[PDB]
Amino acid sequence: SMKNVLVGLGWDARSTDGQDFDLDASAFLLAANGKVRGDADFIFYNNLKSADGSVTHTGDNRTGEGDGDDESLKIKLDAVPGDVDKIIFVVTIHDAQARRQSFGQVSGAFIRLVNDDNQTEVARYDLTEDASTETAMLFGELYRHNGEWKFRAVGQGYAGGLASVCAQYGINAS
Template sequence: MFEVEWDLLNPDIDLDASAFLLNAHGVCEKDEDCIFYGNPDHRNGSVAYQKVHSNKAQFIVAFDRLALQVQKIAVSLTIYEGEEQSHSFSQVAEIRIRLLNHRTGKELATFRFGEDLTEETAIVIGELYVYKGEWKFNPIGSGFFGGLRALCLNFGLEVEQTLPEVAADAQAILPKDLYDLYETFQIGHNVERVRRSIGMTQKQLAEKIGYKSASPISRLERGELDRFSHSQLLLLAEALNVTSRQLLSR
């Protein structure tokens, strides 16, 4: 298991972590080999993604389930709409990647990046790779312009204009008048996933539900709100064209 964590100099930046399952030639053989917020679980159960906090993402790797052709796993971070909003990694204080034993939680290694981050909007932090039958990790820190799209093209994937819609989980929390801190964090996480999957900006979503700025949406998605009302949830669901249960799903 590995965790990617970051500290921001500009709190308005949206960062996303992703993992690319690569063959010996350094490319993905299928679209499903890109694991990110729009495709959080590989079909064969080998890699699973979860955003555990506004500034931390986690990947669980079942090495025994990886396809035989997968020889590397490239770990990356991208800035959402970086070029459009003049955001770059020069506005990120530090990036950390921690390798952990999934069963015990013991930290195996930590790598840090920060001083060399510049104007790029995507970065390959490092890669897991097979060497003489064993998986090892190599820190890289290679930057790209063009965000997630540029990385997908670099790893041999064709990129659609819009990402596929995020499917709702089967189990949902029953509606109530006011949601607590944990439920509000879950709502924010789901709002972010759905919003990005349909190519909507925070500002566009805010305007659709009557806010004058994107700040309330940004705070919700970053997990900074300690409560959230059901009436607000209904407005968000309508604006995103999903059900309230989808935004409440775990």
């Protein structure tokens, strides 16, 4: 029965020579057909907000310099037609392409999730611990049930590739 949601990703950047970590937080869209409603299934800065996902990024940072929810994703399911039926959040490493660094490489990043509808949800994943688990992983999952939206954590890491996990959900390998 979640009508609104708000994810919050925050992490402390290690200041030493102007260096800084930048995790990629995005929402993956999936139709009820089992195929991505978009061969990309990966929306980000290239899209200030989803067109039919009703998802919107508050402000994409690039360092997280601070001490609290750095980035923020606002979502409005009450405005998602029957076209989309699944909307899950994701957070992976970006520079990892050239540096191949794990979330642990950071001082201690953290993800957050609250129901912006009634301010109910309030959970965060421990990266400092699961950091050694992978470099890309989904925080939770969201799907339609009795005509109402329903959240359900799954915790499933995948070393596929921030670039592959995008079309990988569309290209079904028989």
